[PDB]
Amino acid sequence: ATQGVFTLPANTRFGVTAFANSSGTQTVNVLVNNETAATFSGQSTNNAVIGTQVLNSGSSGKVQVQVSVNGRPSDLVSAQVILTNELNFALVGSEDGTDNDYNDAVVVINWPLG
């Protein structure tokens, strides 16, 4: 099934943050209504924050996360969790190789902000 796509409420500020856990340099592309609205790039095997940004979901609310490593797309896993009917997390894991730890780039989207 499709992974890394989330429908947010329209015109809502959300946070996006990416962590790296891989010897390969990770490139995280964040799309809002199918246009790139943030890209993060970095390399770390100790969970370093390679990027964090406040974006707006815009009129469509469509947010998509992609991860690639040296040009090659990573396999993604994702889910959205909602706590006390109010606090939202959209979670993404990715695997760039074979060991299947799916932490190579870890992306966390959270809203509402403020």
Ligand X SMILES: *C(=O)C[C@@H]1O[C@@H](C)[C@@H](O)[C@@H](O)[C@@H]1O
| Helix runs in the chain, H state only | none
Which chain residues interact with a second copy by CB under 8 A?
Answer: 15, 17, 19, 21, 45-47, 49, 52, 54, 77-79, 81, 83-84, 86-87, 89, 91, 93, 100-103, 106, 108, 110-114
Picking from 7, 43, 8, the residue whose alpha carbon sits closest to that of residue 27 is 43
How many residues belong to the site for Ca ion (CB under 5 A)? 8
Q: Give the nearest distance from C-beta 8 to a second copy in angstroms.
A: 14
Q: Which of 8, 16, 19, 22 binds ligand X (CB under 6 A)?
A: 22
Residue 71 interacts with ligand X (CB under 6 A): yes or no:
no
